[PDB]
Amino acid sequence: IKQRTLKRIVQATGVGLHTGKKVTLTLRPAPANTGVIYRRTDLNPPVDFPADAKSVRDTMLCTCLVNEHDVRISTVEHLNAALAGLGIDNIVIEVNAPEIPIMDGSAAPFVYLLLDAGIDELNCAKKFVRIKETVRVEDGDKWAEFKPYNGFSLDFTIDFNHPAIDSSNQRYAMNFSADAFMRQISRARTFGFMRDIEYLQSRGLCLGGSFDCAIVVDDYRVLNEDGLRFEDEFVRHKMLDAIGDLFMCGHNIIGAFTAYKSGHALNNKLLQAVLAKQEAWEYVTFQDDAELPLAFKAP
Ligand SMILES: CC(C)C(=O)N1C[C@H](NC(=O)[C@@H]2C[C@H](F)CN2)C[C@@H]1C(=O)NCc1ccc(C#Cc2ccccc2)cc1
Ligand SMILES: [Zn+2]
């Protein structure tokens, strides 16, 4: 019902999945109506990237923020999913490199870092995007849609034809809440095929890839010694990505998200399509937290 930021400043270091470059990440309290601001500090003067759906590029196997001249910060979807998780509206994210550190491949280390910084509630009203019409976008056999619904629901179906990713759980559905996100989604790691690593590293992608930040799968199985944190970790990670992608507008959404084989590109195309239709959505604030959907009760 009230907007949110951090109580104090926290730092973590790590490496960029794509660049291999060492990075330090600084999260910063920000006053009301600031929004979500990414900032590169390896550049002087430092360059600000406000989170906006029109500022997304989809080309580098992840979600990148870019300005009008294609200067960029890569691999924002995992930290962004953590901000969506804990309802954070106003924050400054500083990196001294062109990319967010990958940490353990999931959103959980971002969740711990934000909880250690404590959440500060503000005396100004948190704005929600309420979906007021069905919108649908497509790409081959891939599709993604939003529908009006008095909460926040995600229904995600993947189709990977691969023995190590059993069909039995290539679909996942949840009603969103900070606690659910934290218990069911936040610890789901990124993954990659051993068959792809030569190609991707020859192009300057996944240079920071390790068994520490990813599930590695060969032609038959998961190679990681300790296996999976969940039998369906693959589709939970795809849903983590989708939550990060939908928060590029900088507001939690009131709606029912459904997707088949969607990714960064189609998830942004959906988010954009919605915001381009004046009549498909509406801001809404909450005077009393009685009318506020259970999806957004504080953690
Ligand atoms: C199959 C593949 C085309 C795909 O469809 N998706 C969808 C998922 N994407 C995400 O999780 C996104 C992109 C970013 F990972 C953060 N969010 C996951 C996988 C993907 O691109 N993985 C990226 C990726 C690829 C490879 C290694 C290695 C590695 C490695 C490990 C050990 C030693 C050397 C190298 C990591 C990662
Ligand atoms: Zn991911």
mmCIF file of C-alpha atoms in Angstrom, residues 20-255:
data_model
loop_
_atom_site.group_PDB
_atom_site.id
_atom_site.type_symbol
_atom_site.label_atom_id
_atom_site.label_comp_id
_atom_site.label_asym_id
_atom_site.label_seq_id
_atom_site.Cartn_x
_atom_site.Cartn_y
_atom_site.Cartn_z
ATOM 1 C CA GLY A 20 34.018 -12.857 -16.823
ATOM 2 C CA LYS A 21 34.830 -9.423 -15.298
ATOM 3 C CA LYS A 22 35.036 -8.881 -11.472
ATOM 4 C CA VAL A 23 32.144 -6.558 -10.328
ATOM 5 C CA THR A 24 31.034 -4.808 -7.145
ATOM 6 C CA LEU A 25 27.306 -4.133 -6.706
ATOM 7 C CA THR A 26 26.037 -1.393 -4.340
ATOM 8 C CA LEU A 27 22.290 -1.100 -3.458
ATOM 9 C CA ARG A 28 21.142 2.321 -2.169
ATOM 10 C CA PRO A 29 18.137 3.831 -0.350
ATOM 11 C CA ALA A 30 16.164 6.245 -2.598
ATOM 12 C CA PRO A 31 13.225 8.575 -1.769
ATOM 13 C CA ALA A 32 9.610 8.350 -3.018
ATOM 14 C CA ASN A 33 8.902 8.494 -6.808
ATOM 15 C CA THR A 34 12.637 7.854 -7.708
ATOM 16 C CA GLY A 35 11.800 4.411 -9.224
ATOM 17 C CA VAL A 36 14.404 1.687 -9.954
ATOM 18 C CA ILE A 37 17.683 3.318 -11.200
ATOM 19 C CA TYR A 38 20.630 1.230 -12.478
ATOM 20 C CA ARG A 39 23.927 3.182 -12.619
ATOM 21 C CA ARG A 40 27.343 2.371 -14.142
ATOM 22 C CA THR A 41 30.236 3.859 -12.061
ATOM 23 C CA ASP A 42 33.127 2.362 -14.146
ATOM 24 C CA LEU A 43 32.205 5.378 -16.411
ATOM 25 C CA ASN A 44 32.836 9.016 -15.306
ATOM 26 C CA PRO A 45 30.510 10.763 -15.118
ATOM 27 C CA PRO A 46 28.473 7.683 -14.048
ATOM 28 C CA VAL A 47 25.515 6.813 -16.386
ATOM 29 C CA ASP A 48 21.951 6.248 -15.063
ATOM 30 C CA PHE A 49 19.536 3.632 -16.568
ATOM 31 C CA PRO A 50 16.012 4.051 -15.127
ATOM 32 C CA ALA A 51 14.103 0.736 -15.394
ATOM 33 C CA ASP A 52 11.612 1.165 -18.321
ATOM 34 C CA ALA A 53 10.106 -1.522 -20.724
ATOM 35 C CA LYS A 54 11.143 0.483 -23.891
ATOM 36 C CA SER A 55 14.850 0.450 -22.689
ATOM 37 C CA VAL A 56 15.216 -3.407 -22.942
ATOM 38 C CA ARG A 57 17.375 -5.321 -25.460
ATOM 39 C CA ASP A 58 17.128 -9.134 -25.704
ATOM 40 C CA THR A 59 20.161 -10.019 -27.837
ATOM 41 C CA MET A 60 22.847 -11.249 -25.331
ATOM 42 C CA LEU A 61 20.867 -14.355 -24.009
ATOM 43 C CA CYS A 62 19.609 -12.125 -21.101
ATOM 44 C CA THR A 63 17.696 -8.856 -20.350
ATOM 45 C CA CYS A 64 19.923 -5.724 -20.901
ATOM 46 C CA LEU A 65 19.017 -2.105 -20.053
ATOM 47 C CA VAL A 66 20.265 0.367 -22.752
ATOM 48 C CA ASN A 67 19.986 4.182 -23.270
ATOM 49 C CA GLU A 68 19.233 5.837 -26.690
ATOM 50 C CA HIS A 69 22.950 5.303 -27.781
ATOM 51 C CA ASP A 70 23.098 1.567 -26.794
ATOM 52 C CA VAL A 71 25.391 1.986 -23.751
ATOM 53 C CA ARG A 72 24.243 -0.851 -21.488
ATOM 54 C CA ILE A 73 24.097 -2.899 -18.219
ATOM 55 C CA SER A 74 23.595 -6.667 -18.829
ATOM 56 C CA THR A 75 21.931 -9.507 -16.904
ATOM 57 C CA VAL A 76 19.485 -7.543 -14.678
ATOM 58 C CA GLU A 77 16.626 -10.167 -14.629
ATOM 59 C CA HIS A 78 17.787 -12.093 -11.441
ATOM 60 C CA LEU A 79 18.278 -8.957 -9.231
ATOM 61 C CA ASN A 80 15.131 -7.430 -10.802
ATOM 62 C CA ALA A 81 13.128 -10.571 -9.872
ATOM 63 C CA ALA A 82 14.330 -10.114 -6.218
ATOM 64 C CA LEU A 83 13.080 -6.464 -6.234
ATOM 65 C CA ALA A 84 9.657 -7.628 -7.636
ATOM 66 C CA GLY A 85 9.798 -10.308 -4.880
ATOM 67 C CA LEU A 86 10.036 -7.879 -1.934
ATOM 68 C CA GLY A 87 7.896 -5.085 -3.579
ATOM 69 C CA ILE A 88 10.852 -2.524 -3.731
ATOM 70 C CA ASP A 89 9.797 0.585 -5.790
ATOM 71 C CA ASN A 90 12.697 3.058 -5.204
ATOM 72 C CA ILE A 91 16.411 2.101 -5.225
ATOM 73 C CA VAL A 92 19.774 2.950 -6.881
ATOM 74 C CA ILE A 93 21.778 -0.082 -8.106
ATOM 75 C CA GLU A 94 25.447 0.777 -8.800
ATOM 76 C CA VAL A 95 27.812 -1.532 -10.694
ATOM 77 C CA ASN A 96 31.425 -0.651 -11.536
ATOM 78 C CA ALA A 97 31.112 -2.842 -14.693
ATOM 79 C CA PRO A 98 28.725 -3.415 -17.623
ATOM 80 C CA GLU A 99 26.881 -6.339 -15.896
ATOM 81 C CA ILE A 100 25.216 -7.547 -12.611
ATOM 82 C CA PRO A 101 27.277 -10.299 -10.881
ATOM 83 C CA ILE A 102 25.740 -13.784 -11.436
ATOM 84 C CA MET A 103 26.476 -14.908 -7.783
ATOM 85 C CA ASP A 104 25.046 -18.539 -7.535
ATOM 86 C CA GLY A 105 22.862 -18.249 -10.698
ATOM 87 C CA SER A 106 19.620 -17.486 -8.755
ATOM 88 C CA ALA A 107 17.791 -14.522 -7.103
ATOM 89 C CA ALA A 108 18.324 -15.781 -3.521
ATOM 90 C CA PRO A 109 21.660 -13.973 -2.812
ATOM 91 C CA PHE A 110 19.907 -10.686 -3.914
ATOM 92 C CA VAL A 111 16.999 -11.507 -1.507
ATOM 93 C CA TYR A 112 19.493 -12.066 1.436
ATOM 94 C CA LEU A 113 21.354 -8.820 0.538
ATOM 95 C CA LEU A 114 18.080 -6.746 0.455
ATOM 96 C CA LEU A 115 16.819 -8.275 3.762
ATOM 97 C CA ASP A 116 20.228 -7.457 5.467
ATOM 98 C CA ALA A 117 19.741 -3.810 4.237
ATOM 99 C CA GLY A 118 16.224 -3.886 5.796
ATOM 100 C CA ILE A 119 13.087 -2.535 4.011
ATOM 101 C CA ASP A 120 11.996 1.062 4.787
ATOM 102 C CA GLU A 121 8.303 1.938 4.170
ATOM 103 C CA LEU A 122 7.595 5.506 2.908
ATOM 104 C CA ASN A 123 4.671 7.912 3.542
ATOM 105 C CA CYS A 124 3.686 7.915 -0.199
ATOM 106 C CA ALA A 125 1.353 5.451 -2.009
ATOM 107 C CA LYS A 126 2.821 2.452 -3.962
ATOM 108 C CA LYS A 127 1.415 2.437 -7.560
ATOM 109 C CA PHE A 128 0.326 -0.946 -9.086
ATOM 110 C CA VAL A 129 -0.370 -1.689 -12.778
ATOM 111 C CA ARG A 130 -3.864 -3.365 -12.887
ATOM 112 C CA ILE A 131 -4.487 -5.314 -16.142
ATOM 113 C CA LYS A 132 -8.044 -4.362 -17.324
ATOM 114 C CA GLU A 133 -8.024 -6.398 -20.637
ATOM 115 C CA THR A 134 -6.564 -9.615 -22.195
ATOM 116 C CA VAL A 135 -3.386 -8.909 -24.282
ATOM 117 C CA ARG A 136 -1.488 -11.622 -26.181
ATOM 118 C CA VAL A 137 1.798 -11.619 -28.235
ATOM 119 C CA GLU A 138 3.311 -14.513 -30.326
ATOM 120 C CA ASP A 139 6.605 -15.717 -32.022
ATOM 121 C CA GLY A 140 6.417 -19.060 -33.939
ATOM 122 C CA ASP A 141 4.836 -21.632 -31.545
ATOM 123 C CA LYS A 142 5.817 -19.321 -28.566
ATOM 124 C CA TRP A 143 3.170 -17.079 -26.860
ATOM 125 C CA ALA A 144 2.652 -14.950 -23.697
ATOM 126 C CA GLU A 145 -0.572 -13.286 -22.400
ATOM 127 C CA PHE A 146 -1.864 -11.110 -19.531
ATOM 128 C CA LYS A 147 -5.568 -11.290 -18.323
ATOM 129 C CA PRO A 148 -7.449 -9.253 -15.653
ATOM 130 C CA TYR A 149 -7.270 -11.037 -12.227
ATOM 131 C CA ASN A 150 -7.501 -9.652 -8.651
ATOM 132 C CA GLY A 151 -4.039 -10.879 -7.607
ATOM 133 C CA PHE A 152 -0.755 -11.854 -9.298
ATOM 134 C CA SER A 153 -0.659 -15.294 -10.947
ATOM 135 C CA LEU A 154 2.065 -16.857 -13.168
ATOM 136 C CA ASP A 155 1.504 -19.947 -15.373
ATOM 137 C CA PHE A 156 4.691 -20.978 -17.285
ATOM 138 C CA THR A 157 5.133 -23.952 -19.718
ATOM 139 C CA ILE A 158 8.666 -24.801 -21.139
ATOM 140 C CA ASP A 159 9.242 -27.428 -23.896
ATOM 141 C CA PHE A 160 12.883 -28.678 -23.823
ATOM 142 C CA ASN A 161 13.306 -32.030 -25.584
ATOM 143 C CA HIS A 162 16.175 -33.418 -23.459
ATOM 144 C CA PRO A 163 16.562 -36.526 -21.269
ATOM 145 C CA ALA A 164 18.037 -34.593 -18.263
ATOM 146 C CA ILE A 165 14.918 -32.282 -18.189
ATOM 147 C CA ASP A 166 12.128 -34.899 -17.694
ATOM 148 C CA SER A 167 8.752 -33.910 -19.321
ATOM 149 C CA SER A 168 7.030 -34.743 -15.937
ATOM 150 C CA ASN A 169 7.671 -31.068 -14.748
ATOM 151 C CA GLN A 170 7.990 -28.782 -17.823
ATOM 152 C CA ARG A 171 5.076 -26.663 -16.424
ATOM 153 C CA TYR A 172 4.721 -24.545 -13.225
ATOM 154 C CA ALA A 173 1.939 -22.273 -11.838
ATOM 155 C CA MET A 174 1.850 -20.097 -8.714
ATOM 156 C CA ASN A 175 -0.110 -17.259 -7.084
ATOM 157 C CA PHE A 176 2.620 -14.696 -6.275
ATOM 158 C CA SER A 177 3.656 -13.574 -2.753
ATOM 159 C CA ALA A 178 7.054 -12.506 -1.292
ATOM 160 C CA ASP A 179 7.132 -15.707 0.865
ATOM 161 C CA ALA A 180 6.137 -18.023 -2.093
ATOM 162 C CA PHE A 181 8.698 -16.342 -4.425
ATOM 163 C CA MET A 182 11.342 -16.759 -1.675
ATOM 164 C CA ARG A 183 10.438 -20.419 -0.801
ATOM 165 C CA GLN A 184 9.572 -21.728 -4.312
ATOM 166 C CA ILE A 185 11.358 -19.566 -7.021
ATOM 167 C CA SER A 186 14.220 -17.413 -5.680
ATOM 168 C CA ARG A 187 16.764 -20.322 -5.317
ATOM 169 C CA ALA A 188 16.201 -21.758 -8.851
ATOM 170 C CA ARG A 189 19.553 -21.481 -10.751
ATOM 171 C CA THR A 190 20.298 -20.688 -14.400
ATOM 172 C CA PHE A 191 21.315 -23.639 -16.572
ATOM 173 C CA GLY A 192 23.304 -24.336 -19.752
ATOM 174 C CA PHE A 193 24.111 -27.193 -22.148
ATOM 175 C CA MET A 194 27.762 -28.391 -22.354
ATOM 176 C CA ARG A 195 27.065 -28.767 -26.169
ATOM 177 C CA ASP A 196 26.668 -24.885 -26.276
ATOM 178 C CA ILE A 197 29.737 -23.671 -24.264
ATOM 179 C CA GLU A 198 32.309 -23.712 -27.150
ATOM 180 C CA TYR A 199 29.925 -21.682 -29.411
ATOM 181 C CA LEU A 200 28.913 -19.168 -26.700
ATOM 182 C CA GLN A 201 32.494 -18.537 -25.358
ATOM 183 C CA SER A 202 33.746 -18.077 -29.011
ATOM 184 C CA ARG A 203 31.232 -15.153 -29.161
ATOM 185 C CA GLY A 204 32.148 -13.614 -25.752
ATOM 186 C CA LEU A 205 29.113 -15.036 -23.844
ATOM 187 C CA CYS A 206 29.185 -17.077 -20.578
ATOM 188 C CA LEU A 207 32.910 -16.241 -19.924
ATOM 189 C CA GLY A 208 32.040 -16.143 -16.151
ATOM 190 C CA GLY A 209 30.149 -19.511 -16.396
ATOM 191 C CA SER A 210 31.158 -22.063 -13.666
ATOM 192 C CA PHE A 211 29.612 -25.017 -11.754
ATOM 193 C CA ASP A 212 29.194 -22.357 -8.957
ATOM 194 C CA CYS A 213 26.629 -20.216 -10.883
ATOM 195 C CA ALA A 214 24.949 -22.812 -13.168
ATOM 196 C CA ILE A 215 23.432 -26.254 -13.610
ATOM 197 C CA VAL A 216 25.548 -27.801 -16.437
ATOM 198 C CA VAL A 217 23.779 -30.566 -18.447
ATOM 199 C CA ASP A 218 25.545 -32.793 -21.062
ATOM 200 C CA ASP A 219 23.569 -34.916 -23.655
ATOM 201 C CA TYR A 220 22.294 -37.332 -20.911
ATOM 202 C CA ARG A 221 22.284 -35.686 -17.417
ATOM 203 C CA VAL A 222 23.062 -32.900 -14.906
ATOM 204 C CA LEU A 223 26.885 -32.957 -14.284
ATOM 205 C CA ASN A 224 26.835 -30.843 -11.045
ATOM 206 C CA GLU A 225 27.984 -33.251 -8.207
ATOM 207 C CA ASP A 226 25.116 -32.081 -5.862
ATOM 208 C CA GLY A 227 22.412 -32.244 -8.584
ATOM 209 C CA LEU A 228 19.322 -29.977 -8.339
ATOM 210 C CA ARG A 229 17.739 -27.916 -5.501
ATOM 211 C CA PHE A 230 14.322 -28.912 -7.034
ATOM 212 C CA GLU A 231 13.286 -31.712 -9.532
ATOM 213 C CA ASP A 232 11.668 -28.926 -11.706
ATOM 214 C CA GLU A 233 14.467 -26.309 -11.083
ATOM 215 C CA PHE A 234 14.511 -25.573 -14.876
ATOM 216 C CA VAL A 235 10.918 -24.249 -15.183
ATOM 217 C CA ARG A 236 11.199 -22.459 -11.758
ATOM 218 C CA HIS A 237 14.268 -20.539 -13.142
ATOM 219 C CA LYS A 238 12.355 -19.682 -16.360
ATOM 220 C CA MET A 239 9.607 -18.207 -14.113
ATOM 221 C CA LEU A 240 12.245 -16.287 -12.035
ATOM 222 C CA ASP A 241 13.456 -14.771 -15.402
ATOM 223 C CA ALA A 242 9.831 -13.886 -16.359
ATOM 224 C CA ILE A 243 9.219 -12.096 -12.997
ATOM 225 C CA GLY A 244 12.478 -10.082 -13.499
ATOM 226 C CA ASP A 245 11.409 -9.227 -17.078
ATOM 227 C CA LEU A 246 7.887 -8.004 -16.079
ATOM 228 C CA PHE A 247 9.347 -5.709 -13.367
ATOM 229 C CA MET A 248 11.242 -3.717 -16.095
ATOM 230 C CA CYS A 249 8.207 -1.260 -15.868
ATOM 231 C CA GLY A 250 9.246 -0.732 -12.178
ATOM 232 C CA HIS A 251 5.740 -1.617 -10.750
ATOM 233 C CA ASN A 252 4.229 -4.888 -9.437
ATOM 234 C CA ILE A 253 1.407 -6.009 -11.786
ATOM 235 C CA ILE A 254 -2.186 -7.089 -10.874
ATOM 236 C CA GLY A 255 -3.029 -9.705 -13.487
#
